[PDB]
Design an enzyme around this catalytic site. Structure first.
Site, PDB file in Angstrom:
ATOM      1  N   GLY B  24      -6.695 -10.260   7.775  1.00  0.00           N
ATOM      2  CA  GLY B  24      -7.450  -9.800   8.912  1.00  0.00           C
ATOM      3  C   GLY B  24      -7.663 -10.978   9.820  1.00  0.00           C
ATOM      4  O   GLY B  24      -7.244 -12.105   9.508  1.00  0.00           O
ATOM      5  N   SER B  25      -8.326 -10.727  10.943  1.00  0.00           N
ATOM      6  CA  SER B  25      -8.461 -11.743  11.980  1.00  0.00           C
ATOM      7  C   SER B  25      -9.324 -12.932  11.533  1.00  0.00           C
ATOM      8  O   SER B  25      -8.981 -14.082  11.820  1.00  0.00           O
ATOM      9  CB  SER B  25      -8.980 -11.123  13.296  1.00  0.00           C
ATOM     10  OG  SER B  25     -10.263 -10.578  13.145  1.00  0.00           O
ATOM     11  N   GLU B  27      -9.402 -14.174   8.777  1.00  0.00           N
ATOM     12  CA  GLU B  27      -8.675 -14.928   7.760  1.00  0.00           C
ATOM     13  C   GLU B  27      -7.420 -15.617   8.295  1.00  0.00           C
ATOM     14  O   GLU B  27      -6.757 -16.360   7.572  1.00  0.00           O
ATOM     15  CB  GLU B  27      -8.305 -14.016   6.587  1.00  0.00           C
ATOM     16  CG  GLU B  27      -9.492 -13.321   5.942  1.00  0.00           C
ATOM     17  CD  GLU B  27     -10.105 -12.261   6.835  1.00  0.00           C
ATOM     18  OE1 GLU B  27      -9.353 -11.602   7.581  1.00  0.00           O
ATOM     19  OE2 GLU B  27     -11.341 -12.087   6.792  1.00  0.00           O
ATOM     20  N   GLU B  46      -7.541  -2.816  -0.085  1.00  0.00           N
ATOM     21  CA  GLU B  46      -8.162  -3.892  -0.862  1.00  0.00           C
ATOM     22  C   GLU B  46      -8.437  -3.592  -2.331  1.00  0.00           C
ATOM     23  O   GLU B  46      -8.472  -4.505  -3.148  1.00  0.00           O
ATOM     24  CB  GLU B  46      -9.449  -4.326  -0.165  1.00  0.00           C
ATOM     25  CG  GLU B  46      -9.170  -5.048   1.165  1.00  0.00           C
ATOM     26  CD  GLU B  46      -9.006  -4.103   2.361  1.00  0.00           C
ATOM     27  OE1 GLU B  46      -9.051  -2.854   2.176  1.00  0.00           O
ATOM     28  OE2 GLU B  46      -8.828  -4.626   3.495  1.00  0.00           O
ATOM     29  N   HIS B  69     -10.689  -9.230   4.037  1.00  0.00           N
ATOM     30  CA  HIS B  69     -11.205  -9.239   5.393  1.00  0.00           C
ATOM     31  C   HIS B  69     -12.647  -8.824   5.495  1.00  0.00           C
ATOM     32  O   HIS B  69     -12.983  -7.627   5.380  1.00  0.00           O
ATOM     33  CB  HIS B  69     -10.349  -8.350   6.288  1.00  0.00           C
ATOM     34  CG  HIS B  69     -10.819  -8.295   7.721  1.00  0.00           C
ATOM     35  ND1 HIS B  69     -10.778  -9.362   8.537  1.00  0.00           N
ATOM     36  CD2 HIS B  69     -11.349  -7.247   8.471  1.00  0.00           C
ATOM     37  CE1 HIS B  69     -11.256  -9.020   9.747  1.00  0.00           C
ATOM     38  NE2 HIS B  69     -11.605  -7.725   9.705  1.00  0.00           N
ATOM     39  N   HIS B 280     -20.423   5.480 -24.644  1.00  0.00           N
ATOM     40  CA  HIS B 280     -20.165   6.275 -23.436  1.00  0.00           C
ATOM     41  C   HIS B 280     -20.880   7.623 -23.544  1.00  0.00           C
ATOM     42  O   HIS B 280     -21.895   7.844 -22.911  1.00  0.00           O
ATOM     43  CB  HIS B 280     -18.658   6.481 -23.282  1.00  0.00           C
ATOM     44  CG  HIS B 280     -18.275   7.356 -22.139  1.00  0.00           C
ATOM     45  ND1 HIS B 280     -16.976   7.773 -21.935  1.00  0.00           N
ATOM     46  CD2 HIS B 280     -19.009   7.896 -21.137  1.00  0.00           C
ATOM     47  CE1 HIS B 280     -16.930   8.539 -20.857  1.00  0.00           C
ATOM     48  NE2 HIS B 280     -18.148   8.626 -20.354  1.00  0.00           N
ATOM     49  N   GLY B 400     -14.488   1.932 -16.387  1.00  0.00           N
ATOM     50  CA  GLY B 400     -14.140   3.324 -16.249  1.00  0.00           C
ATOM     51  C   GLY B 400     -13.800   3.712 -14.833  1.00  0.00           C
ATOM     52  O   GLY B 400     -13.623   4.889 -14.563  1.00  0.00           O
TER      53      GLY B 400
HETATM   54  C1  LIG Z   1     -10.289  -2.370   5.724  1.00  0.00           C
HETATM   55  C2  LIG Z   1      -9.674  -3.391   6.643  1.00  0.00           C
HETATM   56  N1  LIG Z   1      -8.729  -4.232   6.157  1.00  0.00           N
HETATM   57  C3  LIG Z   1      -8.143  -5.161   6.922  1.00  0.00           C
HETATM   58  C4  LIG Z   1      -8.505  -5.272   8.257  1.00  0.00           C
HETATM   59  C5  LIG Z   1      -7.868  -6.311   9.148  1.00  0.00           C
HETATM   60  N2  LIG Z   1      -7.093  -5.674  10.213  1.00  0.00           N
HETATM   61  C6  LIG Z   1      -7.624  -5.328  11.405  1.00  0.00           C
HETATM   62  S1  LIG Z   1      -6.512  -4.585  12.529  1.00  0.00           S
HETATM   63  C7  LIG Z   1      -5.272  -4.751  11.330  1.00  0.00           C
HETATM   64  C8  LIG Z   1      -3.908  -4.245  11.736  1.00  0.00           C
HETATM   65  C9  LIG Z   1      -3.884  -2.724  11.818  1.00  0.00           C
HETATM   66  O1  LIG Z   1      -2.523  -2.294  11.812  1.00  0.00           O
HETATM   67  P1  LIG Z   1      -2.059  -0.936  12.541  1.00  0.00           P
HETATM   68  O2  LIG Z   1      -2.853   0.208  11.961  1.00  0.00           O
HETATM   69  O3  LIG Z   1      -0.552  -0.884  12.517  1.00  0.00           O
HETATM   70  O4  LIG Z   1      -2.533  -1.155  14.065  1.00  0.00           O
HETATM   71  P2  LIG Z   1      -1.664  -2.029  15.103  1.00  0.00           P
HETATM   72  O5  LIG Z   1      -2.297  -3.397  15.051  1.00  0.00           O
HETATM   73  O6  LIG Z   1      -0.262  -1.968  14.551  1.00  0.00           O
HETATM   74  O7  LIG Z   1      -1.846  -1.318  16.422  1.00  0.00           O
HETATM   75  C10 LIG Z   1      -5.784  -5.390  10.092  1.00  0.00           C
HETATM   76  C11 LIG Z   1      -4.956  -5.676   8.868  1.00  0.00           C
HETATM   77  C12 LIG Z   1      -9.540  -4.349   8.777  1.00  0.00           C
HETATM   78  N3  LIG Z   1      -9.937  -4.411  10.070  1.00  0.00           N
HETATM   79  N4  LIG Z   1     -10.076  -3.444   7.934  1.00  0.00           N
HETATM   80  C1  LIG Z   2     -13.384   5.887  -8.983  1.00  0.00           C
HETATM   81  C2  LIG Z   2     -13.776   6.978  -9.944  1.00  0.00           C
HETATM   82  N1  LIG Z   2     -14.071   8.209  -9.461  1.00  0.00           N
HETATM   83  C3  LIG Z   2     -14.425   9.220 -10.263  1.00  0.00           C
HETATM   84  C4  LIG Z   2     -14.491   9.013 -11.633  1.00  0.00           C
HETATM   85  C5  LIG Z   2     -14.893  10.132 -12.565  1.00  0.00           C
HETATM   86  N2  LIG Z   2     -13.798  10.519 -13.453  1.00  0.00           N
HETATM   87  C6  LIG Z   2     -13.605   9.968 -14.671  1.00  0.00           C
HETATM   88  S1  LIG Z   2     -12.240  10.592 -15.565  1.00  0.00           S
HETATM   89  C7  LIG Z   2     -11.918  11.647 -14.231  1.00  0.00           C
HETATM   90  C8  LIG Z   2     -10.731  12.566 -14.398  1.00  0.00           C
HETATM   91  C9  LIG Z   2      -9.415  11.800 -14.442  1.00  0.00           C
HETATM   92  O1  LIG Z   2      -8.360  12.760 -14.401  1.00  0.00           O
HETATM   93  P1  LIG Z   2      -6.823  12.350 -14.637  1.00  0.00           P
HETATM   94  O2  LIG Z   2      -6.614  10.958 -14.092  1.00  0.00           O
HETATM   95  O3  LIG Z   2      -5.960  13.483 -14.141  1.00  0.00           O
HETATM   96  O4  LIG Z   2      -6.700  12.286 -16.241  1.00  0.00           O
HETATM   97  P2  LIG Z   2      -7.086  13.539 -17.176  1.00  0.00           P
HETATM   98  O5  LIG Z   2      -8.595  13.558 -17.169  1.00  0.00           O
HETATM   99  O6  LIG Z   2      -6.453  14.725 -16.493  1.00  0.00           O
HETATM  100  O7  LIG Z   2      -6.476  13.190 -18.511  1.00  0.00           O
HETATM  101  C10 LIG Z   2     -12.903  11.470 -13.136  1.00  0.00           C
HETATM  102  C11 LIG Z   2     -12.896  12.242 -11.843  1.00  0.00           C
HETATM  103  C12 LIG Z   2     -14.170   7.663 -12.150  1.00  0.00           C
HETATM  104  N3  LIG Z   2     -14.221   7.401 -13.477  1.00  0.00           N
HETATM  105  N4  LIG Z   2     -13.823   6.705 -11.268  1.00  0.00           N
END
Ligand SMILES: Cc1ncc(C[n+]2csc(CCOP(=O)(O)OP(=O)(O)O)c2C)c(N)n1
Ligand SMILES: Cc1ncc(C[n+]2csc(CCOP(=O)(O)OP(=O)(O)O)c2C)c(N)n1
Ligand SMILES: Cc1ncc(C[n+]2csc(CCOP(=O)(O)OP(=O)(O)O)c2C)c(N)n1
Ligand SMILES: [Ca+2]
Ligand SMILES: [Ca+2]
Ligand SMILES: [Ca+2]
Ligand SMILES: [Mg+2]
EC number: 4.1.1.7
Lengths: 524, 525, 524
Positions: B24-25, B27, B46, B69, B280, B400
């Protein structure tokens, strides 16, 4: 009654009937016996959940309710919360905690120090000390999200609380009305209005809280009365003014020097519903020229305190815009002349210039279309080229956090099923929350997604060029097939390699039954 | 010298040569003039960045360095950080901040109260008070991540700091060696060894810090000497023991009552490199049955403090495992009774039982394969059916948090190009960090992704049943085409609708030179 | 100019001329070349420094500026901050930090993670990222403390910053005016006024933010118009209404059931400038009895969100009180009849009853006298026996933290030189901030301190009775000679073992030109 039953009654009584979520075991006792009058909108990753909720809240002008999974789910959403903070979005974020009996040993899925996790991105963050307190805590979340300045809040709830008995005195929560619809006292407001009336060359700057307040029409009347040019404050998350109205002057550059120069010669500058200011680029200089005085109306004490110049009034944007618009004198000065329409850019049969894309959207999109911007390198052009007559017509990531527009566009389209939503999104940005496409498909939400594909993080490349920084890695994103990604999640896909294909794709998309992704080949 | 030059020198002198990032900018001033002796690994989101770095750190057993970023980028990675905290992963997370002159006004991209953002998921979080201090701050970050108990740290750096003059006394940082390779004093160690030799029916429980420390072989020797049954601690993020060795008893169920039952009759229970315990499900009961004493060896004071029973020793798992293994006497007791073989479940001509998938993987995969698991309803069967005989052969999200295995599998494969990585991921889990696929394609990292597609959040449907919970929304995830997602990001894709297609797909995957995704149609619960 | 000169310029321009401090080496670069238009008020311990500034701010109704030494100094003051948070006191707390070059090594006197130290007891907490930012950060601190809801703020400054060059654009900060003097919009205010006009049996409950706003007189007019009884909200840190006015009904007991019973049959209960409610004892029951509706006007969103019943409006108390007082109609109902005079308690020739102490004070003290209460066990009696006609006549620890009254009385007396301040403190509470006495002596601040010596933590002993709690250690504090303590710090001391000596001591004290302490032997 149970905490479960009492909480859903509080929600429905407070106008909430939709839950945006990605489920987990700590959340099942909350989601079991889901009320038939409630709607659950599933998204596949939490950044997507929050982004959809955010779009919904922003467009609807009411709080949105989110259900996430413990610390990991909350964590996955914290980028989205960064945007929501900056846009004053009223989001009630609830996350499931482990059963109280297993918190001490830190069993799997235990949200440790839960209230600290989402800070500093929330107005209020809390875990109740007993099950019977949960409905009261939910009431506090609802109001803290909803009161000026609006923003996200966090409530963590042990999953064993839901089945416990609620305090019967909790009925007192159901119908509470909490208002922050306030404006400056009469004496001081009169003083402000006189200063506005006496200005020989006033200007008005508007920010996102104007659009959130639906104060746009009042702001138009105020500008027409003062015969004042109207700018949008920099790094704009929303559009607060008709962009073809005669007073409109466009988006302010996000720089200190640029802005003081723009405002040079204006003796009074009234800022409404904006931070002063959301600068971005390094552009050192004077905050204001001598001869310019600034007056800010903001809903946010944090904004009033940090403004480096000017007077400030902390109050509700709706109430203040309406009062001012109706109290100021009609100046006899000449009404500002409308800015000259954007000039057409020569377009060959090669890749599309962004200017061309926006001109073409403007020509073809409905008058009440809603636009979302995640194409950082083409924002200036988009502002100049789209005629947005109506409130609630533009959303862009308020903290600069990518991953907002694709899900938010789905949320906005859900909030406004009668208004065609069109999200313009860089090829780089499209990936951050690509799985949100699935929700559009599954819930039949017919958002149109326009992917500007130039194979690079273009804005970054430009900036690197400005700093004359060489050997910067990671700026190129070749080799993504956005039509295949769309097919992956069940969304219709089209491609446009030149202007005529752009026309045909937009024609087909506007008429298509479901959501549509258009991959557009653009120039870097 | 500049902060930039001094910082990069610090990093190379401390053994870092890879940056995992999404730029990002804020960085840019740090990424510019990227040294030729470093490589940058880009990922598109990220959570993916941090996940890849996490797998890499865990498999390589060394710190990984990350650049994100500002607040939005850091925010996007906080789920991943939740897993890294629980796995004790040594991740050095840096994020760019606005130029110092523009922090006060809170200009766009300003990380407000930056050090508080990733709390409480980091061992250390900091923003330096001046440019000259950056190198020193970076040194603190490297050592805080690397010292026992290892884990993630966070440093926020104003982008205008990089071009500033670095303290000339910074050179003293470059070759700093910090060690926590420590074990219990001779006196107390001898008392412990006596207790083990005196036990009539000892049992051993092993956690992920064993595998992190590569103490697995020393634990094998310890178990053999004591002729002791060996469990893996519940909710296992790693595999600390050869799963078909005669002492091996299996993965413990994550239940209080269940565990105390398994340990019944054992007079001394030695836990090494695990929290006591990462339960758990709600399984109320006794922590330990009468007649059983527990002694825990952990690298983490927070684990020792919160254990609801047992004695504890806070020390380096590598050093303690080695000492105990070489100190304990050779018991003449009988080895544990042979564990039964898992049933071969009958497989019709349609969708695959996961048991079929695991039996087939185990028949076809090389002996030194490395599995990742984010197929949450199938964990028990996976542990029963995979013979994992070498260290570093299993990774699963320690907190988890879904979205770990897909990117982590890429980082593990990057760290171990000689061992084939096979990531077994549910259809639900596959989406959290789907964009990581692109990093595999772009850098040609030949991970194999096996998507278990049963069309539902299966483990959640199951728990909904046990809880007898009716009308739970959001448990179904129909309508995702993983072969198209794969194509979207440039990854070769295969489909396996039945047993013969499964065998054929795996055979082609194993021969392939680049990454490969296999969508497997599995039975619905 | 320097950060130093630019910061003092900002301070004076924003109305600050007094610095309450306990100095240290991190603060010497700030304190050097102390401007001639500023005064410094030294105290010997930081809880005293803050207590004194606190009393000064509350009485003066303007922010108070404080300067402390790093973490340890800040730390010593954090109990005082608990009170200031609860009383919404506008305190600008600055603390010195090590020089930037040594912060990383954590040299002695480094305030580690400085902004987190005073959380959660401050509205805003900050350490600037550069020297040139200090003036701006100070401006933020000034305005965050001063905006509704007022409260304490924290600013840490590395000591090397003061001699560095300021930003030339800092001059824009000097004359910023920031207002939160706002009230509910006309349309919703008219609805509120109608509700009040239509109520058949209204009641009014007033909290400390009324006295802070100097809205007492408007509240009197409002009560008179509505012919409504007036309570003071429980756990009162200030007196918002004349206590012998005919509407006045006294201090509400700090219990849930006690309060709903008090309000039974009142159809509309208007609460102004109070939390809803600062309960204390466990006294479970109904928040409100059926047939009572509550409307809360508060300056604090956190109060509005957490009220378990009623509607709320978040606005400036001064603005709202004045508006309502002037809009409501004159009710035909009969004006409430004044409460009966307190009965005289039987007093023999030995140790004094508190009831006797207050009657004597009331009979001898001047009409414009200001009292401070730190005698927990005699609060009820105090409110019933002291006639307080004027605003700003009462202060007690808003968070219940002992150590407020002694120093705050010194601050108040400094703010109100023509009004005699009389602090009534228990022998137990007197110790927490005993060294504050020295400040009174050194600056010749003529506060009167009345120590109620009963040789025990009476309130605790009592509570233990209601808990049937036997064998509680540490409830007794024998063996303290308060006259010697006073002498210790340079304050004239008197004694009163009986009523006769009480009269003579008080007459002497009132005549005194310097501070005087009176040790009084009370019963229990
Ligand atoms: C979550 C996140 N990660 C990284 C950045 C850093 N960042 C800002 S603009 C940009 C480029 C975006 O690319 P694109 O969607 O192609 O737009 P363009 O610059 O090509 O018009 C990045 C990596 C951000 N602003 N937010
Ligand atoms: C980021 C995140 N969001 C939601 C959950 C809740 N969660 C735990 S297991 C699960 C189901 C995972 O399903 P899948 O990956 O299809 O495996 P399966 O249970 O079908 O064997 C969810 C929604 C989590 N653990 N982490
Ligand atoms: C800083 C602090 N510590 C402890 C307490 C608990 N506490 C409240 S009242 C009290 C005793 C006060 O007794 P005294 O001041 O002698 O008056 P009395 O109770 O005798 O009327 C104590 C210890 C408190 N409120 N604040
Ligand atoms: Ca691009
Ligand atoms: Ca599944
Ligand atoms: Ca006492
Ligand atoms: Mg946090």
């Amino acid at each position: 009654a149970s905490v479960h039953g009492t909480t859903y009654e509080l929600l429905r009584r407070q106008g909430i009937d939709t839950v945006f979520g990605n489920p987990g075991s700590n959340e099942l006792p909350f989601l079991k016996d889901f009320p038939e009058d409630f709607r659950y909108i599933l998204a596949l990753q939490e950044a997507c959940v929050v982004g959809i909720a955010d779009g919904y809240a922003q467009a609807s002008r009411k709080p949105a309710f989110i259900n996430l999974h413990s610390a990991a789910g909350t964590g996955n959403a914290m980028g989205a919360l960064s945007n929501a903070w900056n846009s004053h979005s009223p989001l009630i974020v609830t996350a499931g905690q482990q059963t109280r009996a297993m918190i001490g040993v830190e069993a799997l899925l235990t949200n440790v120090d839960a209230a600290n996790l989402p800070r500093p991105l929330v107005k209020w963050s809390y875990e109740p000390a007993s099950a019977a307190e949960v409905p009261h805590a939910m009431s506090r979340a609802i109001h803290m999200a909803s009161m000026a300045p609006q923003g996200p809040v966090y409530l963590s709830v042990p999953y064993d609380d839901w089945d416990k008995d609620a305090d019967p005195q909790s009925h007192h929560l159901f119908d509470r009305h909490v208002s922050s619809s306030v404006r400056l006292n009469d004496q001081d407001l009169d003083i402000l209005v006189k200063a506005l009336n006496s200005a020989s060359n006033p200007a008005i700057v508007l920010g996102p809280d104007v659009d959130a307040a639906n104060a746009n029409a009042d702001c138009v009347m105020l500008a027409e009365r003062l015969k004042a040019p109207v700018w949008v404050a920099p790094s704009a998350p929303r559009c607060p003014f008709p962009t073809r109205h005669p007073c409109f002057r466009g988006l302010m550059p996000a720089g200190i020097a640029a802005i003081s120069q723009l405002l040079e010669g204006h003796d009074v500058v009234l800022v409404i519903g904006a931070p002063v200011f959301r600068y971005h680029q390094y552009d050192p200089g004077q905050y204001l020229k001598p001869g310019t005085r600034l007056i800010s109306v903001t809903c946010d004490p944090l904004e009033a305190a940090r403004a480096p110049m000017g007077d400030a009034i902390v109050a509700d944007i709706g109430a203040m815009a309406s009062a001012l618009a109706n109290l100021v004198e009609e100046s006899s000065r000449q009404l500002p002349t409308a800015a000259p329409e954007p000039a057409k850019v020569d377009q060959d049969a090669g890749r599309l210039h962004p200017e061309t894309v926006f001109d073409t959207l403007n020509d073809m999109a409905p008058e009440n279309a809603i636009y979302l911007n995640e194409s950082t390198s083409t924002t200036a052009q988009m502002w100049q080229r789209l005629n947005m007559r109506n409130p609630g017509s533009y959303y862009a990531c308020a903290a600069g956090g990518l991953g907002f527009a694709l899900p938010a566009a789905i949320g906005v389209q859900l909030a406004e099923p009668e208004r065609q939503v069109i999200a313009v999104i860089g090829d780089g940005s499209a990936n951050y929350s690509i799985s949100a496409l699935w929700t559009a498909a599954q819930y039949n939400i017919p958002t149109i997604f326009v992917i500007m594909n130039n194979g690079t993080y273009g804005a970054l490349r430009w900036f690197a060029g400005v700093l004359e920084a060489e050997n910067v890695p990671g700026l190129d994103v070749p080799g993504i097939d956005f039509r295949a990604l769309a097919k992956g999640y069940g969304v219709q896909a089209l491609k446009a390699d030149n202007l005529e294909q752009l026309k045909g794709s937009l024609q087909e998309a506007l008429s298509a039954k479901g959501p549509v992704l258009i991959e557009v080949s653009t120039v870097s």
